[PDB]
């Protein structure tokens, strides 16, 4: 069973969420299996950001066991801004564990290096998720975002427990049951950092949402990149903390790391500056 | 000064928000002046529903001093559903006090009776408001919603404290600085109750947002309707509680009504059923 261990108050620099397996912290990057059911194409998603929120929570690469923390810019807590007509993130947003967008090779599909993280996942179901949740999802397709000039694929997925899951099998089904969502997704990822002063992003394939099989192929490639990474065989692991508690044949296996995590110290959410309310009316 | 007096927990049947003047409850419908600055047409808006929320909070006609209370449906609380691409309400939503959409006469602009309520206000500024807030706003324009067959005007306004307030002076400025907001507003009020089984709504004037001059005239008419109402001179006040604490020449003036309200009993927000998360795709 997977649960969460929260340290501190949400919306603070001290906030951390660790994932626990049967009560013991494990690495959110390395120790949660990619596959919940490999041959039925059912994946474990680690949720970072609930739909319609702003705090830019991420699995952190550089802390032991890779807890989810809030990203920062210029020493400050990062919040993604509201871009009309969207409120925060328009998906439950997270990642697949045991994957890596390899920054050390140019990816041919996109002609750009990877962004150095777990492959990203957009979960489209009705219920709002929680940070650190491990949920089981089916892949429906994938979009090739070039985010600040780096390969940053976005998998389109649904929770297998969603009432609609049985009716969603491939990417065309997304348009059928969620009409306009894929177009809004393309817009969101193009424009969301314009309020921060960044350029508009771009997609490969003129923004096409590639199908389920394409998605599976890219997921599997990023899983192979991770296999090399966790074996200690990347040419440059970028300072990622490869400590894990479930992979005893890897060089960075450590039983002790789980017990060194402090106990939960969950505090009430901290306030968020009112500026985060603002609705930006921007576009590329 | 205006403040709030909260009874109970948000998102419960017991929840009430009274508006206080100098610490004493007043009627949110009758006792807050329509104008904050009459010469400059600066209005007092009573906020009911913060942007990006679902709970259908309203000034209630049926309780003394007209506190803000959540609408109910089939013994439970009423929430407006999320309709893609929108999250709950896309405005800070409320009303102007001392106004009435008269239900006893058909309105010629829209050829329908009024919806029996204060005139409604959409406040488009950056900051999310709070329930029971009295904010001061400039009027920019107005849309003629026919809501389930009834005249249900929606004023478009901006908080005078908004950074953009100086640049927002008439309805065309809304498209200039908030492109797409008026179109989304038309869509929102057309479709928001389709998940509840209602027919789509309609607008007069093909959904045009009329300008400030036009809006001021409609607001004035609804103020005159309220002046008739509060004087006890409507042919049918529809059981509205007309009790007030600041209008001594009205038949329903009663300063003791203020002293009858219980003290604040603010509790933490209650949870909302997870079904309200759902995003409806109503194309
Ligand atoms: Mn990042
Ligand atoms: Mn990511
Ligand atoms: Mn990115
Ligand atoms: Mn990424
Ligand atoms: Mn109503
Ligand atoms: Mn109203
Ligand atoms: Mn209405
Ligand atoms: Mn109304």
UniProtKB/Swiss-Prot annotation, chain A:
Residues annotated as catalytic: 89 (proton donor)
Covalent crosslink: Glycyl lysine isopeptide (Lys-Gly) (interchain with G-Cter in ubiquitin): 238, 278
Presence of keyword Transport: no
Q: Name one GO biological process term.
A: phosphate-containing compound metabolic process
Q: Which cofactors is this protein said to need?
A: Mg(2+)
Q: Name one Pfam family in it.
A: Pyrophosphatase
One term of GO molecular function: inorganic diphosphate phosphatase activity
The record's note on quaternary structure and interaction partners says: Homodimer.
Q: What is this protein called?
A: Inorganic pyrophosphatase
């Amino acid at each position: 069973t997977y649960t969460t261990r929260q340290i501190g108050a949400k919306n603070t620099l001290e906030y951390k969420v660790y994932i626990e397996k049967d009560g013991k912290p494990v690495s959110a990057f390395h120790d949660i299996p990619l596959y919940a059911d490999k041959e039925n194409n059912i994946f474990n998603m680690v949720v970072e950001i609930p739909r319609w929120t702003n705090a830019k929570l991420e699995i952190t690469k550089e802390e032991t066991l890779n807890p989810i923390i809030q990203d920062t810019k210029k020493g400050k807590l990062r919040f993604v801004r509201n871009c009309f007509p969207h409120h925060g993130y328009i998906h439950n947003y997270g990642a697949f564990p045991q994957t890596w967008e390899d920054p050390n090779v140019s990816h041919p599909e996109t002609k750009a290096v990877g962004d150095n993280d777990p492959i990203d996942v957009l979960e489209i179901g009705e219920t709002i998720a929680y940070t650190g949740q491990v949920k089981q999802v089916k892949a429906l397709g994938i979009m090739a975002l070039l985010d600040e000039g780096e390969t940053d694929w976005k998998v389109i997925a649904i929770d297998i427990n969603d009432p609609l899951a049985p009716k969603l099998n491939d990417i065309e089904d997304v348009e059928k049951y969620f009409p306009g969502l894929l177009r809004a997704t393309n817009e969101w990822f193009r424009i969301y950092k314009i309020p921060d002063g960044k350029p508009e992003n771009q997609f490969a394939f003129s923004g096409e949402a590639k199908n389920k099989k394409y998605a599976l192929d890219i997921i599997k490639e990023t899983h192979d990149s991770w296999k090399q990474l966790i074996a200690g065989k990347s040419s440059d692991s970028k300072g990622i903390d490869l400590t894990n508690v479930t992979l005893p044949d890897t060089p960075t296996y450590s039983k002790a790391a789980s017990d060194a995590i402090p106990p939960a110290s969950l505090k009430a959410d901290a306030p968020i500056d009112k500026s985060i309310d603002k609705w930006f009316f921007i576009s590329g």
